[PDB]
Design a protein around this ligand. Structure first.
Ligand SMILES: [Ca+2]
Lengths: 365, 359
C-alpha cells in the first residue's frame, strides 16, 4: 500500500472519521483507523463497534493498492503539524507504516486490516434524500432532550420516524420531551427507529451546511447517511420508544404568549437565586402578566415581572428552570407560546410562529 | 447604605474584584461620594471604586460575589441598579427585577494588616505586563519550596526585573523605567502574579507600585491590588546563566517550534522528550516511544561548534518559543549535561535557561 496526498486533502477526512473514537480506546485496534487503497481511492474508516464513519479521498498522485490500520490520534496530529501544503507520502512496511514529508519522517505501528472490526452487511428498507439544513433542524430542535446514560437504554438516543411526506424526530429523558417534524416531498413507508446518542452527535457534526444533499437509508437494525464523500453508518438501539402522542397535554386551554428573549433573560436572572440542586422557579400567571420567582434554602429571593398576553385563569406552577432555559435556547425565535392546564400537569411550549417543533416539560413539586 | 448606579459602571469593577465563607463575599462601602468594592482571599485583595452622582447614603455590608455579579451582568444593557440595605438582606432592584441577597457584616470582612511602603515607582501598565508575560510560565506551581511558587521582582539601577524558576527551567526579563532605584528584591506569590497580570488591560495608563517588607501594592486607574509577599531564599539568576557557552545555534522560531511539536507526537506520552543532534549547519531532532514508533526532523540551521547530542523536555522548550513570539531564536550550549540559554536574537530584554533531559 502506497499513496502521496496533499495535507489539506487529508486533514478534514481524518478529523471526521476519528469522531467515533475515544481518548482511552478499550482495545488498541479501536484507536486505529482503517486505511484502504483501491481503484484510485483512499478510504479511511473509524469505528466504536456500534457505528462507523468512512471518508473517500481521491488520489491524483501515484499509488499502490492495499490496506492496514494505524493509530488515529498520532496520524492526525502528524498531518496537522506539517506545514501548509505539505505533501504526505505513506508506505506500508509490514508491522510499520512510514510517513514522510520534506525531511520529516515517522514510523507508526500497524495492526492488520483483516482484524479491523467490520459492521455486518444489511439491507435498506427505506431510502430518501433531503437538504442538510432539514436534518440539522430536526436534530438541533430535539438533541438536548435525549437522556444521558439512563438505565432505560431506550431513552439514550433519538427516535427517527418516517410517515408519508414527513420526517420526525423525538427525544425524551422522562422529565421533558422534544418533537420536531419536517416535510420531505417523497412519500415514505412507516418506519420508526432509535439512533444511539453518540450517532446522533456524529450525524449532526457531518453536516457541513453547504448545498450537498444528504441521502438516508434505513434498515430494521441500521441507519446510513451519505454526505459528499462521507458515509456514516450506525447500528440502531434495539428497543421500543414510548409513544410521544400520549405525553402531549390533551386539552391545554390556557395560552400564554411572550417575547422569547425577555422570557429567557428573566428565567436566567431568577435562576441565580434558585435551589442549587433542584433549580426550582415558580410561575404565577394572571391577566397579561407573568411573575417569576425563585428562592433558595438560604431565604434569598428573586422576582421578575413581565408583560405578556394571557387571558386564562390565574394559576401557579413550578419548573426546573434548566429545562425551561433549554427549550427557550433551542427555539431562537421572536415569540414563544406556552400552553398550560393546571399546577400538576405538563406545559407545552412552542415557537409562537410555528407548530413544527413542540416541547413538553413536567412540573416540579 | 443606599445607592443607585448604572450597570455600565459596575461591570468591569465587579469582574476585577471577583478575581480573588465570607471570602466568597464582596465588601461594599459607600463613603465620600464613592462606592468601593473589595474582594480577598486573605493573602491578597482587590479594591475598585466607582463615583456616585445620584442620591446615596453611607454605610457598608458584604454580599455573595458570584450572585451579585451574575445579577448585575444578567440585567439588560443600560439598566440602572438601585441598592438598599435592610438588616440581614441587601435589596437590589432594576425595573421590575427584584433581588434579596443575604449579607454578612462589614465588620467581619478581613483586612490585610496595615503596612508601610519602602520602595515606590511608577511605570507604564504595558511594561509591567510584558515583564510578567515573559516569565510567568516558569514559576513553580505546588513545590514544597514555597518561595518558587511565585515571581521575583527586583529593582536595580534604572531597571525593574522579573525572575521565575521551578528548578528545571528559568526565565528572566528586565525593562527600563527611567528612574534611578534602590537595589531591592521581593517574591510575589503565583496567585498574586496572575491576578496582577489580569488587572492590566493594554491601555496607556500609569501604574504606581509600592513595595513594603511584607506586601506589594499596585494602583492603576481606580483599581488597587495588594498582596502579601513570600519570605524565602530565591536563587540568583546570575548563577544559573551559562558562564561560557561555546556552541551557538540559530533558527527561525516557527520552524524550530513546529519540528519540536511534530517530533513530540512519537515521544513517551507520560514524559515527552526529544533528542537534538547538532552538527555543521544542521539540526536533527528525534523521538521514540515504548511502541518503538520513531520520529525524525532535519532542519537547516546556523550552527557553530563541535558536534554534540543533547535531550530536552518538549514542553519546556515550547514554552520558551511561545514566549518569544519573534523571528529568530538563539540557543547557547556548552555540553550534553549542562543547561542551555535560549533568547531572541534581536532582543536582550529576556533570557531563558533550560536543563537537559536524559533519554
Ligand atoms: Ca441608563
Amino acid at each position: 500500500m502506497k499513496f502521496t496526498v496533499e495535507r489539506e486533502h487529508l486533514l478534514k477526512p481524518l478529523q471526521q472519521v476519528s469522531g467515533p473514537l475515544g481518548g482511552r480506546p478499550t482495545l488498541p485496534i479501536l484507536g486505529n483507523l482503517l486505511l484502504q487503497v483501491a481503484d484510485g481511492t483512499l478510504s479511511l474508516t473509524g469505528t466504536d463497534l456500534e457505528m462507523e464513519m468512512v471518508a473517500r479521498v481521491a488520489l491524483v498522485q501515484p499509488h499502490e493498492p492495499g490496506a492496514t490500520t494505524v493509530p488515529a490520534r498520532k496520524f492526525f496530529d502528524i498531518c496537522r503539524g506539517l506545514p501548509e501544503g505539505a505533501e504526505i507520502a505513506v508506505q506500508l512496511e509490514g508491522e510499520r507504516m512510514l510517513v514522510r514529508s520534506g525531511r520529516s519522517r515517522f514510523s507508526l505501528s500497524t495492526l492488520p486490516a483483516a482484524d479491523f472490526p467490520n459492521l455486518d452487511d444489511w439491507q435498506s428498507e427505506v431510502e430518501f434524500t433531503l437538504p442538510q439544513a432539514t436534518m440539522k433542524r430536526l436534530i438541533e430542535a430535539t438533541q438536548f432532550s435525549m437522556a444521558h446514560q439512563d438505565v432505560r437504554y431506550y431513552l439514550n438516543g433519538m427516535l427517527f420516524e418516517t410517515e408519508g411526506e414527513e420526517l420526525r424526530t423525538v427525544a425524551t429523558d422522562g422529565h421533558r420531551l422534544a418533537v420536531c417534524s419536517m416535510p420531505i416531498g417523497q412519500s415514505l413507508p412507516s418506519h420508526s427507529v432509535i439512533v444511539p446518542r453518540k450517532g446522533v452527535i456524529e450525524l449532526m457534526r457531518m453536516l457541513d451546511g453547504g448545498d450537498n444533499p444528504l441521502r438516508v437509508q434505513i434498515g430494521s437494525n441500521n441507519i446510513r447517511a451519505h454526505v459528499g464523500d462521507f458515509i456514516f453508518t450506525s447500528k440502531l438501539v434495539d428497543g421500543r420508544f414510548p409513544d410521544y402522542r400520549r405525553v402531549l397535554p390533551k386539552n391545554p386551554d390556557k395560552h400564554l404568549e411572550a417575547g422569547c428573549d425577555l422570557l429567557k433573560q428573566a428565567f436566567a436572572r431568577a435562576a441565580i437565586l434558585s435551589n442549587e440542586k433542584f433549580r426550582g422557579v415558580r410561575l404565577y400567571v394572571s391577566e397579561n402578566q407573568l411573575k417569576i420567582t425563585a428562592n433558595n434554602p438560604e431565604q434569598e429571593e428573586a422576582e421578575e415581572i413581565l408583560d405578556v398576553t394571557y387571558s386564562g385563569a390565574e394559576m401557579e406552577i413550578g419548573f426546573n428552570v434548566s429545562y425551561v432555559l433549554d427549550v427557550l435556547n433551542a427555539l431562537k425565535c421572536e415569540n414563544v407560546r406556552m400552553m398550560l392546564t393546571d399546577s400538576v400537569s405538563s406545559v407545552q411550549i412552542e415557537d409562537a410562529a410555528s407548530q413544527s417543533a413542540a416541547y413538553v416539560v413536567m412540573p416540579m413539586r
